[PDB]
Design a binder for these strands. Structure first.
Ligand SMILES: OC[C@H]1O[C@H](O[C@H]2[C@H](O)[C@@H](O)[C@@H](O)O[C@@H]2CO)[C@H](O)[C@@H](O)[C@@H]1O
Ligand SMILES: OC[C@H]1O[C@H](O[C@H]2[C@H](O)[C@@H](O)[C@@H](O)O[C@@H]2CO)[C@H](O)[C@@H](O)[C@@H]1O
Lengths: 437, 437
DNA sequence: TTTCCACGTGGAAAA
DNA sequence: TTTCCACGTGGAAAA
C-alpha cells in the first residue's frame, strides 16, 4: 500500500484498542474532512521496515519504543518536532524512550509493564515467589485446574524471570549501551530459564502455550494466574473472572524485572501527510478525550499524557503495573534490539521444547544477539566475488573445450574437461578425482 | 506438541466457533473424564503437514476438505471407519468430499459457500451483477461510503468471479481430475480477474484489503457489501448493521461460481486417542446438541448431519448459502490443491498490486498450479549429484596442490591452481580466464 | 526424464 | 577484516 495525500492510515498491534483509536480517527474526519483508517496487520513491526524502505507502509505506525531506533537508523521515520508547550504535556522519561541520537523519532503514548494477574476465587492469596508455584500447581491440579499459564512463544513474557537473578540484554555503562556486552548467558539468566524449563519438565506448564491459549485458559477460569499487560484487562472484565493485578513473584529472593515498553507512534518518513499526522497525534489522540476513547477499548497502561494519567493512576491496577515497572527497566531503542529479541525467542523456545539444553540455548543466544549484521555492500561484495570466480572458471573451460581437441564425449561436465587437461600435463586422475603424477 | 493418550487436542481455524467446540469438549470431559483442548493456531493448514510427518501435531484437525487429500497422500491421517448406521446420518455428498482413493479420511461437518452480504439500510436492493458495482460505488462515495469490500489476500474470495466466465482449477473428465489440465489462464479467468483489477484501478477497491479490514468496514457500516461465509454472521449480528445474505452477482450474465468447502475433521495418524477421537466426533460433535453448541458460536453453514440441517435449512441465510453452493462446485481434495491455491493467491495479489499484468500473473499461475512437486528422492538424487561433482573437483585440486610444485602463493583459490595446470599443458590464461594455446 | 552450471549466503580459516 | 569452497535447488538444455 501507499500513503496518499489527504488520507491517514495507521498500523497498531491487534492486542491494542484499535476500535477506540478508529473512533478518534472518526472525530478527526468530522472536524477536518481527512479520512483515517486504522489497521492491525500481523507482524507489523516486521512488515513496516520491509515496505517503508521503498516508500510504502502506513502514515503512522504504533509499537513499543524498542523497535524505533532501528527504523530511524534505516531512515524510515520522520523527525518529530513538537513545540515546547506540547512536550511539557508528557512525562520527560517517556520522551527519553523515543529519543535516538539526539532526535525525537516518535510520540510516546503509554507505559506498559507486565504484572501478575490472578483469579481471586481460585486463589485469594497469590504467591509471592516463583519457587512456591510448583506446589501450588499440584494442589490446583487435584481440583481440575492449573497454577499458571502465560505466553511462552514471545520472550517478552519470560524476560522478567530471566532478568530476576541477573540476566540482562545490553549492559549500560558510561551513558551508553554496549552492543557487544550481552547478559543472556550469565548465571542469573541460566537460573531463570532453568526454573522455567523445570516447570515444563515437571508438567506445570506446556512448552507450546502461546498468547491465545493462556488468555483463553485464564478467562475461562481454568488457570489461576497469568502474566500479561494492561491491554488484556478488558477481555477479563467481559469474562466471569474475579481477577487481581499485583507484583510479579520473586525469584531467588529478587524481584522479577520486566522490560518496560512505551507504546509510541512513529510517522512514516515517506508520508505526504506529516503535518496531518502531527495534528492528529498531538491534538486528537494525545488528549484526555482521545486517550480515553482508546483506553476504554483496551487499557493503555500509564499514559504519557500527564493530565489524563492523573486520573488513570487512581486505578490500583495501574499502581500495580507501575510497581512492576519500577522493578524493571526501560527497554533500549537501539537498532540491535531486534537481534536480541529474536535470539532470546529462539533460546526460550528451544530450551522449553528440549531441543537444546538451557546452557546451549543461551550460549547461542549470546553470540547471536551480539552478531553484527553484514551491510548491503558487504553482501554485494561477496555476491560479486563469487560471480567473478565462476565467470573466470567458465571462460577457462570454454577455451579448453574449443581448442583442447580432447577426446571428450558429446556431453560431459567440466570435471571431465579438467581430467583431460590433467592427463595432457602428465597426470593420472582416477574416477573419484584422486590425482597424481 | 505431541499427542498424549488419554487427552484430546483439537486444531480449528480462528474464524470458526472454537468456543462452542470447546463447550462440546467440556461435556465430553464430564461424561468420560477425558480432557479436550481446542486451539486455533495461525496457518494450521500449513503447520499440520510439517509437524504430523514426525508424529507431532494435534489429535484432530479441522479444515475444509480440499487440504485433506494431500494429508492422506503423506500418511498423516487415520482411515475413518464409521459404521454404515452412522454414515446414513450425513448427506452422501458430504462423505464424497472426504473420500480419497476409495477411503474416508475425515468426518464431514458442514458445507460452506460464499454469499453476497449487504447492508439493507444503505442498499435496499443489492446489485444483481458485478458490472453495476462501479456506478453503485460512485454513488456511495458521494455519501462517504463504498460499495464493496472483501478479502483480496485469499484467492478463495476472488475465485467465484474468476470462475464465472469459465475459469476452472482442474478439469474433470471420465471420473477423474486431470492435474495437467488447469484453467486459470483461459479467457474466462482473465475476464474475471481483469474486472477485479479494473475495480482497483478505478479506486472502487484497494489492493491491500484483507479479511479484518473488510469485516471491520462492513460491520461498522462504512461499506455496503461484503463477500463472506456463514462463520462471519455472528459478528455482524452483534454489530448495528441490518444485513441480508443473497446470491452473488453475475458476471457477463453468468453466476459467480464459488468453490464449495466441506469443513471436515481428520484424525492424526500418530494419535494414540483414535478411538476417543472417533467417540468425540461421532457421539458428541456430530449430534444436534453438539453442532448447535458450535453453530451458536459461529454459524457452521449447512451441516452434514441430516437431523440438525433440517432445522438450519429453515434459515433464509442458509438457503442463500446453498443457492450459491448449487452455482459453484465442490472443491477437489487432490494433493495438488495446495499448489493450485498458492499459484492463484500469488496471481491475484500480483495483478491487484500492478506488479504483474493479469495475463502475466495468470500465465505463471497456470504453470505453477500444474507443476509437479519433485519427490524427496528426486531432490536427494540432485543433492547427491552436485555433492559428488564438488567432491571429484576438490580431490583433483588437492592432488594438484600437493604434487604440482606449481610455485603458488601461500593462499590462492582453485582458479589459480587451474591456471598453473593450464600453462603446464602449454596454455595461456588471461586475467579473466580467456584461455588459448 | 536426467544432467549441468549458476546462484547468493554460510561458516571455516587466516590474518 | 577478507577469502574461499560448500551447500541444495533453479532453470536451461538435450533427449
Ligand atoms: O517478545 C518480544 C517482543 O517484546 C515486546 O513486544 C511486546 C509489546 O511491547 C507489547 O505491547 C505487547 O504487544 O506484547 C509484545 C510481546 O508479544 C517488544 O516491544 C518487541 O519488540 C519484541 O519483539
Ligand atoms: O484462499 C485459499 C484457501 O481457500 C479455502 O480456505 C477457506 C476455508 O475453506 C474457509 O473455511 C474460510 O476459513 O476461508 C478460507 C480462506 O481464507 C481452502 O479451504 C484453503 O485450503 C485455501 O488455502
Amino acid at each position: 500500500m501507499k500513503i496518499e495525500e489527504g488520507k491517514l492510515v495507521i498500523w497498531i498491534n491487534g492486542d491494542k484498542g484499535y476500535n477506540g483509536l478508529a473512533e478518534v480517527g472518526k472525530k478527526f474526519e468530522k472536524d477536518t474532512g481527512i479520512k483515517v483508517t486504522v489497521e492491525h496487520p500481523d507482524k507489523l513491526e516486521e512488515k513496516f521496515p520491509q515496505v517503508a524502505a521503498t516508500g510504502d507502509g502506513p502514515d503512522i505506525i504504533f509499537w513499543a519504543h524498542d523497535r524505533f531506533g532501528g527504523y530511524a537508523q534505516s531512515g524510515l521515520l520522520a523527525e518529530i518536532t513538537p513545540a515546547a508547550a506540547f512536550q511539557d504535556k508528557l512525562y520527560p522519561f517517556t520522551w527519553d524512550a523515543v529519543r535516538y541520537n539526539g532526535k525525537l523519532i516518535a510520540y510516546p503514548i503509554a507505559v506498559e509493564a507486565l504484572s501478575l494477574i490472578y483469579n481471586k476465587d481460585l486463589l485469594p492469596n497469590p504467591p509471592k515467589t516463583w519457587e512456591e508455584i510448583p506446589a501450588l500447581d499440584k494442589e490446583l491440579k487435584a481440583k481440575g485446574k492449573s497454577a499458571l499459564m502465560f505466553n511462552l512463544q514471545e520472550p517478552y513474557f519470560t524476560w522478567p524471570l530471566i532478568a530476576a537473578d541477573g540476566g540482562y540484554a545490553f549492559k549500560y555503562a558510561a551513558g551508553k549501551y554496549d552492543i557487544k556486552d550481552v547478559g543472556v548467558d550469565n548465571a542469573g539468566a541460566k537460573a531463570g530459564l532453568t526454573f522455567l524449563v523445570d516447570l515444563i519438565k515437571n508438567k506445570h506448564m506446556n512448552a507450546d502455550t502461546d498468547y491465545s491459549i493462556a488468555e483463553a485458559a485464564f478467562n475461562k477460569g481454568e488457570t489461576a494466574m497469568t502474566i500479561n499487560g494492561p491491554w488484556a484487562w478488558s477481555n477479563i472484565d467481559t469474562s466471569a473472572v474475579n481477577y487481581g493485578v499485583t507484583v510479579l513473584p520473586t525469584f531467588k529472593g529478587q524481584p522479577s524485572k520486566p522490560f518496560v515498553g512505551v507504546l509510541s507512534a512513529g510517522i512514516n518518513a515517506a508520508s505526504p501527510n506529516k503535518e496531518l499526522a502531527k495534528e492528529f497525534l498531538e491534538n486528537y489522540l494525545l488528549t484526555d478525550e482521545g486517550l480515553e476513547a482508546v483506553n476504554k477499548d483496551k487499557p493503555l497502561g500509564a499514559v504519557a499524557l500527564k493530565s489524563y494519567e492523573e486520573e488513570l493512576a487512581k486505578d490500583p491496577r495501574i499502581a500495580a503495573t507501575m510497581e512492576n515497572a519500577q522493578k524493571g527497566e526501560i527497554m533500549p531503542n537501539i537498532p540491535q534490539m531486534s537481534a536480541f529479541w529474536y535470539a532470546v525467542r529462539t533460546a526460550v523456545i528451544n530450551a522449553a521444547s528440549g531441543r537444546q539444553t538451557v546452557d546451549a540455548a543461551l550460549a547461542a543466544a549470546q553470540t547471536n544477539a551480539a552478531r553484527r549484521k553484514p551491510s548491503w555492500r558487504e553482501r554485494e561484495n561477496n555476491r560479486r566475488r563469487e560471480r567473478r570466480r565462476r565467470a573466470v572458471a567458465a571462460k577457462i573451460y570454454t577455451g579448453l573445450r574449443a581448442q583442447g581437441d580432447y577426446n571428450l564425449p558429446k556431453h560431459c561436465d567440466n570435471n571431465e574437461v579438467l581430467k583431460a587437461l590433467c592427463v595432457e600435463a602428465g597426470w593420472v586422475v582416477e574416477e573419484d578425482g584422486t590425482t597424481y603424477r
